[PDB]
Amino acid sequence: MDFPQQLEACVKQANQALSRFIAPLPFQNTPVVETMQYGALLGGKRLRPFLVYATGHMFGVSTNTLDAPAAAVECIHAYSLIHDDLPAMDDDDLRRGLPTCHVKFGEANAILAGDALQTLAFSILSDADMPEVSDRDRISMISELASASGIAGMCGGQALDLDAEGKHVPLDALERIHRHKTGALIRAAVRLGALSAGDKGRRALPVLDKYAESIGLAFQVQDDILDVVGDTATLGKRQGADQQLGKSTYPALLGLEQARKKARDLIDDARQSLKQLAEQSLDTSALEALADYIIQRNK
Ligand SMILES: O=P(O)(O)C(O)(Cc1cccnc1)P(=O)(O)O
Ligand SMILES: C=C(C)CCOP(=O)(O)OP(=O)(O)O
Ligand SMILES: [Mg+2]
Ligand SMILES: [Mg+2]
Ligand SMILES: [Mg+2]
Numbered sequence: 001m002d003f004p005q006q007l008e009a010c011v012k013q014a015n016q017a018l019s020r021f022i023a024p025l026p027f028q029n030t031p032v033v034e035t036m037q038y039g040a041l042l043g044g045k046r047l048r049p050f051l052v053y054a055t056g057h058m059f060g061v062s063t064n065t066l067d068a069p070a071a072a073v074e075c076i077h078a079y080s081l082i083h084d085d086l087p088a089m090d091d092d093d094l095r096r097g098l099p100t101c102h103v104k105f106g107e108a109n110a111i112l113a114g115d116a117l118q119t120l121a122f123s124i125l126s127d128a129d130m131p132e133v134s135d136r137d138r139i140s141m142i143s144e145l146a147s148a149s150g151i152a153g154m155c156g157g158q159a160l161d162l163d164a165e166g167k168h169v170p171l172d173a174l175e176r177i178h179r180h181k182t183g184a185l186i187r188a189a190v191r192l193g194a195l196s197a198g199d200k201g202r203r204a205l206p207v208l209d210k211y212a213e214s215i216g217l218a219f220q221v222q223d224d225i226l227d228v229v230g231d232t233a234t235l236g237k238r239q240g241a242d243q244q245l246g247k248s249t250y251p252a253l254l255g256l257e258q259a260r261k262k263a264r265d266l267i268d269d270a271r272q273s274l275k276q277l278a279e280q281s282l283d284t285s286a287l288e289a290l291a292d293y294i295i296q297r298n299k
Contacts, residue, residue: 003289014049017067035105035113040078043096048073048189054286055193068128069192075121076149082114097236148188157181164248183216211273218266224249263295
């Protein structure tokens with residue numbers, strides 16, 4: 001019922017999960033591991049873990065087993081931001097209210113920490129305790145995180161994003177960028193939550209996919225909107241960063257009003273998909289509240 005309290009509960013759960021998977025690693029208290037801990041744990045809304053937990057919870061899977069996919073997806077997410085902020089990429093000096101990884105620890109440490117966080121995601125999925133999760137479903141989790149994170153998803157989208165700098169690409173190309181760079185990982189969170197539930201989760205996938213696809217695109221449209229109108233102290237990252245690099249964005253192409261409308265229509269579409277699940281007596285309340293927050297949030 002109370003969404004801010006659920007978000008904070010999720011932040012604590014996910015941070016604990018991440019910390020536990022990071023703690024047995026060697027080279028604690030050296031720069032690369034400290035970079036990983038800074039970039040993964042210090043700040044962030046943990047909405048992808050939120051998606052993993054909320055989805056798995058719908059099928060009655062234990063929060064403790066969901067710690068694994070929640071932490072894995074957040075490792076990929078964390079890695080993606082570390083590399084995204086690099087000078088050769090978006091060259092941003094602030095994130096989550098603090099110096100970016102490459103500023104505080106140097107570029108080499110940032111590259112390697114992001115590299116290692118990606119690897120850790122796959123160590124988590126292959127090694128972590130998930131008692132109710134069949135090997136078949138664990139393999140599917142790994143396969144999904146891989147396809148969603150790599151050239152067919154997030155990385156591919158990062159390449160499209162970089163290519164579209166200064167090119168003011170049309171809506172169809174814009175959507176392709178956003179769905180890959182941001183949509184794909186968000187859909188992986190939902191899929192990993194569902195796969196944790198086995199066959200019952202798999203049966204929901206056609207519908208959860210449509211939900212995930214809509215909130216995932218909406219997530220990036222809101223990110224672009226926030227880049228224009230948000231305050232740096234609230235965002236935790238610099239307002240007007242996109243405009244400075246000439247990024248193809250929703251607000252740059254369509255203006256702020258039409259971008260907002262696109263985000264709102266995507267969320268209404270996400271809500272519609274969830275109605276199909278609520279019909280089968282699955283509790284969609286956390287997923288609908290998350291869907292609304294994705295476009296109501298100011299950070
Ligand atoms: O947090 P950022 O840098 O505004 C962003 O959302 C970061 C990001 C990195 C990787 C994939 N998706 C988004 P971006 O696309 O560079 O606008
Ligand atoms: C994929 C995108 C839009 C990058 C930022 O995601 P978030 O806005 O979830 O960033 P944090 O909460 O993790 O800082
Ligand atoms: Mg970027
Ligand atoms: Mg960026
Ligand atoms: Mg952005």
